[PDB]
Structure formats: C-alpha cells, structure tokens
C-alpha cells in the first residue's frame, strides 16, 4: 500500500498547495458593501476590493488597511494586528510551508533511503495548516475592526487547511510504517 499512500499524499499536497495559492491570489474573500473609487456591492480579497454591478462594475481598488484618520497610535495591539493583516504573513507562510512539504515528498521519492524527509514533509504540512488557521483568525478579526458573506477564496483556504492536515497525517503514517518495516527487518536479520 506504499504506492497508493504515496500517490494520495502527493495528490493531496498538490491540491492543498494549489487551493492555498488560488485563495491568496484571487479576491473573492468577502462580499460587503463599499466603494472602489479613491456604497455598492463589492467583492474583496486580501489585497484589493472590486465593485460588482453598478456603473463601475469590474473596477478594482487596493484595500486601505489603515482607515479613519489621525493615525491613532494609542494601542500597540491594534497596530500589530493591522500590520499582520496587511502583510498577510500567515497565508503566505502557509503557501511556503506547503511548497516545502511538497518538495520534501518529491525529494524523498528520489532518495528512498532517508526516512527523515517524510517526517519533515509531515511537519511542514501540519505547520502549514496551523498557519492557515492563524491567518483565517487574523483576517476575520481585522474585518471586525450591513450583511456580509464569504466568497470562494475563503472556502478554498479552508479546504486547503483540511487537505493539508490530512496529508500531514498520511505522511506521519508513512514514516511510522517505514520505521516499523526497518525494525521488523532488523529483528528478522538478527
């Protein structure tokens, strides 16, 4: 079942990476009323807000991550949260960790003798899922600071988190199986 497990792990890793990259790139994260001119139905992502319908349908404007005026630097928690949201450090970190896990799996398919590469890939996928969770929480909290809804980029990110956790579990299972087989062979040959 090593071949089936490896195929499932690779397919899931690629799917999670692609979903996370698409969610980061696209701008259907939220559906809220707003403007795209520097109150109409607009769809926004992590970088830009674009208006749908109306006279200016299709016009995109970059998201202002520091609204209001006077630049009130009274509470450092708000500034830290706003900087974290503007940088989108956690979704990008999730993308990078998923890419690293996929590269680890690909390299392991070459060497086939260093078991720690599989463990590294599993750790990468689990950490990518955790980073995705943090990024989702940061995005929602920053949005908190008019009925709204979440688009398909948000749910693509959620699905990517789920698949990343599943692939991490599969990679850990493969590492455990490899070490069990090594121990069994050593016991038989001793």
Partner 1 sequence: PQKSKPGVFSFLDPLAYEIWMCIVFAYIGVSVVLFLVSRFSPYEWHSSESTNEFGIFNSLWFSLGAFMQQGCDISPRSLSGRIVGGVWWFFTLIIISSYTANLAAFLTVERMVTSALSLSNVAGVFYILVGGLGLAMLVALIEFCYKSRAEAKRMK
- The footprint of partner 1 (CB under 8 A) covers 70, 72-73, 75, 77, 119, 122-123, 126-127, 129-130, 133-134, 136-137, 140-141, 144-145, 158, 161-162, 165, 168-169, 172-173, 175-176, 179-180, 183-184, 187
Residue of 13, 27, 119, 125 that binds Cl ion (CB under 5 A): 27
* Closest of 45, 66, 65, 41 to residue 55, by C-alpha: 41
The CA–CA distances, whole Å, from 187 to 2, 116, 182 equal: 21, 21, 9
Q: Distance from CA of residue 85 to its chain's centroid? A: 14
How near is the Cβ of 35 to partner 1 at its closest, in Å?
22
Q: How many other C-beta atoms are found inside a 10 Å radius of the C-beta of residue 120? A: 20
Greatest alpha-carbon pair distance for the chain in Å reads 80
Q: Does 165 bind Cl ion (CB under 5 A)?
A: no
Q: Distance from CA of residue 38 to its chain's centroid? A: 30
Task: Please tell me whether residue 155 adopts helix, strand or coil conformation.
Answer: helix
Tokens at 99, concatenated? 């890419």
Among Cl ion, partner 1, none, partner that 65 touches (CB below 5 to 8 angstroms by kind) = none
Q: How many other C-beta atoms are found inside a 10 Å radius of the C-beta of residue 3? A: 7
Residue of 16, 19, 36, 45 that binds Cl ion (CB under 5 A): 45
Q: How many other C-beta atoms are found inside a 10 Å radius of the C-beta of residue 78? A: 13
Among partner 1, Cl ion, none, partner that 47 touches (CB below 5 to 8 angstroms by kind) = Cl ion
Q: Which is nearer to Cl ion, 43 or 108 (CB)?
A: 43
Q: Does 65 bind Cl ion (CB under 5 A)?
A: no
Q: Which is nearer to partner 1, 51 or 124 (CB)?
A: 124
Q: Which stretch binds Cl ion (CB under 5 A): 38-46, 69-77, 98-106, 131-139?
A: 38-46
For Cl ion, the binding residues (CB under 5 A) are 27, 45-48
């Amino acid at each position: 079942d090593r071949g089936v497990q490896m195929l499932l792990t690779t397919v899931g890793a690629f799917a999670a990476f692609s979903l996370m990259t698409i969610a980061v790139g696209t701008d259907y994260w939220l559906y809220s009323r707003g403007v795209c001119k520097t109150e109409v139905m607009t769809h926004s992502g992590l970088w830009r807000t674009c208006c749908l319908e109306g006279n200016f349908k299709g016009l995109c404007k970059q998201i202002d991550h520091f609204p209001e005026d006077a630049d009130y630097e009274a509470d450092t928690a708000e500034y830290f949260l706003r900087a974290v949201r503007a940088s989108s450090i956690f979704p990008i970190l999730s993308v990078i960790l998923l890419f690293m896990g996929g590269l680890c799996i690909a390299a392991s398919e070459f060497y086939k003798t260093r078991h720690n590469i599989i463990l590294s890939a599993g750790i990468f996928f689990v950490s990518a899922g955790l980073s995705n969770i943090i990024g989702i929480i940061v995005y929602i909290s920053a949005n908190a600071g008019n009925s709204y809804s979440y688009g398909w980029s948000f749910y693509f990110g959620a699905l990517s988190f789920i698949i990343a956790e599943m692939v991490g579990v599969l990679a850990v299972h493969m590492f455990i199986d490899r070490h069990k087989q090594l121990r069994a062979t050593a016991r038989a040959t001793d």
